[PDB]
Design a protein around this nucleic acid. Structure first.
Lengths: 62, 189, 314, 65, 132, 138
RNA sequence: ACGAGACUCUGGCAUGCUAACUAGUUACGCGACCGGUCGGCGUAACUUCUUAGAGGGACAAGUGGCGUU
């Protein structure tokens, strides 16, 4: 899969059995027309960049 | 004009990762002569990431048994093994450590499956902050196990483990555990 | 009137500039009382990047320095605070030899006689004090005092019979002479408590401004409201230009500069930070004074800043 | 406020079939400068003085006492 | 947690209701007036009441306050509320009216009015919502 | 004669007695660099090269320190020295230089002249520490 | 109305105050070289470190974001 970074744009919330995954909207700085839900691990702030070697998968949402 | 200890400079370092640069602090106003400052980093979020990377790295050095709570011993064993890496490589130790952290901070690994689920694991992105936490933890643990039941003493396992993590040698615990974490992430799609 | 103008932006305070004092001795010597627990000095330098750079810090109180004043010179300053403590500061070495305590509660303002023989202070203690500088016990009158707080008391700067205009939170204005120490005249008619009462150096005019919404003036020769004047908001400080019949007051964010002809507005010199948000409350100008030259205005503000204005016309 | 607004007396009472226990707890009232209550009120109690009923003046006047 | 208690909130409500005139936008003046006008036995409780007083004053600055009502400002509320448009919205020279109300007015002895203009009725009677 | 400035960290407390001099710095019978740890030495040296040797060349300050532990005695000598210098400059020469040095020290370390409020917490019975509890079997 | 909170004691800041040969900071008779270590003393700058006494201080108080706005 092509390597393309994504930056956090909104902290959706917490998921997981123990509430450790974090739903967050991430946008790719190539077209600003895609903003996908990603579950992330660990302390996540708002506005950092998440390196993404894999993007064919989506976080559960809606 | 602030230099780490007395001779390490903070102008030759470069992140070139864009992923984890705000959670690594070596070139900004966080420059100091002593990797021992206590501080209030661990009393609030949005302020824990402002600790200098070398300060966090020396903070996590002490662990297990009486070794905990001996930050001065960590300063000694950090000036040591840093003299050692600088003599072994000739390069600037801070940039080598930043390279090791970039190479060792995991990008994606497994947690619980989205909304709900505990039978198996589902791959998710690792935050840059948690990834530097994991990188530091693996560095320290690999160093102390390399010292464990070994003729060679401290200030060596730190040095060799850090240099292999920077270079990618499989004898490094940090980057081998990194590749392990991404392999679990791949196997748990 | 003459078109006003600004003189840039500068850093001079981190908290509210509670009180200001410009002496009629030097053009570059100002004293300011702030909520920074200190008393600051200002030497005006006429540079674009900086106008008043502090040189000396005056820390002597435990609460907010409520009011600082100078009589005519630039040698000594008189300061009150919110613990009821009275002090005088010499600018030579930043110390003080004597302390005056007479109030068990808040002290809002303090008055310094031009001849340095009378210290009169307003207090929330509900007690007007008539004391001096050298600590000489003098006959005092406690009758006919305010039934409410006592905010501001000033002095008349001329060689004549002394006069005290005492204002309270009772919406009353009280007139005191130093010779008899009794209530010569009582003025009532405020719809709200009165904040600051001031007098002109002419020794024939006086004014009061508070929450009644009126900056109406009183004549101290006999005692009668003479000129009508209403406001858009509350009034917090008043003064006169010591060259004109101008009444200078702050209507919160803006000021009220009237003309000499008939005190009729020409143009309100509005001040407002340019922002996309109208949700930011404008600062309230607590106090203001003129410079030695009379063309430079120094005013404290709620935005912990000094807005220095001058004349450029066109 | 329990220490000074409450008077507590624990006593043992004789009975034919055994010993009874009595706990008499009285909450002392509050009176100021008095002899029956503590001089300070309950800290959670806030009392407000009713403001004066002065008529608002509608025209400035000169009063000669 | 920083949620105000009904004791602090109630006392601040009573202070705003009864002593509005003295109360200002500054916290410290609020603290001093609350000390002067009421017996508040604790400095911390004084300060909590003063803080809620300040916030309530900002709330009135926003406009109406749902939790309190002061008549001293209610009179001026009614003073502002007396808004009279220059031209009445009910005085329209042309009033569109349907044929059925036209017939009703004609039967009401008001068929000779001049402001009424008949409107085209809808061609269908599809006004109900599709059931289901 | 002291600038009356003091300086604390943990239960330790240090004050710099101040006088007119030529920037000779002494700490309880010893200068600022012969302090024993020789690894905390950089912590003591922090101010004198944080702002330069020239500023420490026209004032003699002797730092007396009383308190517990080695490192807790540090962070008191250094903070006392820095805040004594800033107070000396503020009350004697001017504010512009004082303001510059205060900004420099705060930017390097905001807790360079403010004390660290943290103190050891009390211990509660049924446990050895403040938050640790005795082990029991279920 | 009780409980919670409020409350009290504590932990932190006042160079503001009442002040202390049962505490120190200031008072100097080897000035040991022609500006210096002291609790090796070379036998009246007063409360700043120490001492808890009375007041003060912090209240989500200001800004921004979200939120029945």
């Amino acid at each position: 899969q092509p390597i393309k970074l994504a930056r956090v744009t909104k902290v959706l919330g917490r998921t997981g059995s123990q509430g450790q995954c974090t739903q967050v909207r991430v946008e790719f700085m190539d077209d600003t027309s895609r903003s996908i839900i990603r579950n992330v691990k660990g302390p996540v702030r708002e506005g950092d960049v998440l390196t993404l070697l894999e993007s064919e998968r989506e976080a559960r949402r809606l | 004009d602030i230099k780490l200890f007395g001779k390490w400079s903070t102008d030759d370092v470069q992140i070139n990762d864009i992923s984890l640069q705000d959670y690594i602090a070596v070139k900004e106003k966080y420059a100091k002569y002593l990797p021992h400052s206590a501080g209030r980093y661990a009393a609030k979020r949005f302020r824990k990431a402002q600790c200098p990377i070398v300060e966090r790295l020396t903070n996590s050095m002490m662990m297990h048994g009486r070794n905990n709570g001996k930050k001065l011993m960590t300063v000694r064993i950090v000036k040591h093994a840093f003299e050692i890496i600088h003599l072994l490589t000739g390069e600037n130790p801070l940039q080598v450590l930043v390279n090791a952290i970039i190479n060792s901070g995991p990008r994606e690994d497994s947690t619980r499956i989205g909304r709900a689920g505990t039978v198996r694991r589902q791959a998710v992105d690792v935050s840059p902050l948690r990834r530097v936490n994991q990188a530091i933890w693996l560095l320290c643990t690999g160093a102390r196990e390399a010292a464990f039941r070994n003729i060679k003493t401290i200030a060596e396992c730190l040095a060799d483990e850090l240099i292999n993590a920077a270079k990618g040698s499989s004898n490094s615990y940090a980057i081998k555990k990194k590749d392990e974490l991404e392999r679990v992430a791949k196997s748990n799609r | 009137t003459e078109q006003m103008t600004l003189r840039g932006t500068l850093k001079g305070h981190n908290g509210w500039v509670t009180q200001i004092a410009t002496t009629p001795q030097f053009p570059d010597m100002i004293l300011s009382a702030s909520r920074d627990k200190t008393i600051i000095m200002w030497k005006l330098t006429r540079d674009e990047t900086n106008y008043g750079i502090p040189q000396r810090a005056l820390r002597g109180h435990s609460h907010f320095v409520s009011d600082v004043v100078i009589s005519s010179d630039g040698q000594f300053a008189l300061s009150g605070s919110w613990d009821g403590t009275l002090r005088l500061w010499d600018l030579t070495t930043g110390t003080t030899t004597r302390r005056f305590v007479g109030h068990t509660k808040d002290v809002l303002s303090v008055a310094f006689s031009s001849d340095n023989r009378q210290i009169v202070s307003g207090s929330r203690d509900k007690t007007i004090k008539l004391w001096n500088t050298l600590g000489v016990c003098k006959y005092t009158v406690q009758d006919e005092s305010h039934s409410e707080w006592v905010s501001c008391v000033r002095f008349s700067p001329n060689s004549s019979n002394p006069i005290i205009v005492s204002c309270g939170w009772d919406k009353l204005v009280k007139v005191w002479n130093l010779a008899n120490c009794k209530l010569k005249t009582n003025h009532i008619g405020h719809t709200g408590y009165l904040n600051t009462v001031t007098v002109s150096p002419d020794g024939s005019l006086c004014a009061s401004g508070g929450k009644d919404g009126q900056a109406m003036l009183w004549d101290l020769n006999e005692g009668k409201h003479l000129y009508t004047l209403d406001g858009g908001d509350i009034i917090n400080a008043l003064c006169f230009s010591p060259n004109r019949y101008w009444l200078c007051a702050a209507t919160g964010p803006s000021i009220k500069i009237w003309d000499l002809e008939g005190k009729i507005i020409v143009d309100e010199l509005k001040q407002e930070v340019i922002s996309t948000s109208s949700k930011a409350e404008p600062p309230q100008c607590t106090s203001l004074a003129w410079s030695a030259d009379g063309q430079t205005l120094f005013a404290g503000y709620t935005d912990n800043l000094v807005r220095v204005w001058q004349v450029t016309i066109g | 406020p329990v220490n000074y607004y409450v008077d507590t007396a624990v006593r043992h009472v004789l009975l034919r079939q055994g010993v009874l226990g009595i706990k008499v707890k009285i909450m002392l009232p509050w009176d100021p400068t008095g002899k029956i209550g503590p001089k300070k009120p309950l800290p959670d109690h806030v009392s407000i003085v009713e403001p004066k009923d002065e008529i608002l003046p509608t025209t400035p006047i000169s009063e000669q006492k | 947690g920083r949620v105000r208690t009904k004791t602090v909130k109630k006392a601040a409500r009573v202070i705003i209701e009864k002593y509005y005139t003295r109360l200002g936008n500054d916290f410290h003046t609020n603290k001093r007036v609350c000390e002067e006008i009421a017996i508040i036995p604790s400095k911390k409780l004084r300060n909590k009441i003063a803080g809620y007083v300040t916030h309530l004053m900002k709330r009135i600055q926003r406009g109406p306050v749902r939790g309190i009502s002061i008549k001293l400002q209610e009179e001026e509320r009614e003073r502002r509320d007396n808004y009279v448009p220059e031209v009445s919205a009910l005085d329209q020279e042309i009033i569109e009216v349907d044929p059925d109300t036209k017939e009703m007015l004609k039967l009401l002895d008001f068929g000779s009015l001049s402001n009424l203009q008949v409107t085209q009725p809808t061609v269908g009677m599809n006004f109900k919502t599709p059931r289901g | 004669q002291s600038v009356q400035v003091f300086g604390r960290k943990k239960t330790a407390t240090a004050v710099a007695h101040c006088k007119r001099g030529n920037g000779l710095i002494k700490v309880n019978g010893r200068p600022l660099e012969m302090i024993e740890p020789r690894t905390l030495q950089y912590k003591l040296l922090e101010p004198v090269l944080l702002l330069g040797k020239e500023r420490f060349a026209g004032v003699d300050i002797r730092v007396r320190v009383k308190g517990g532990g080695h490192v807790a005695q540090i962070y008191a000598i250094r903070q006392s020295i820095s805040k004594a210098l800033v107070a000396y400059y503020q009350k004697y020469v001017d504010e512009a230089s004082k303001k510059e040095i205060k900004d420099i020290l705060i930017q390097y370390d905001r807790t360079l002249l403010v004390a660290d409020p943290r103190r050891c917490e009390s211990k509660k019975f049924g446990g050895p520490g403040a938050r640790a509890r005795y082990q029991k079997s279920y």
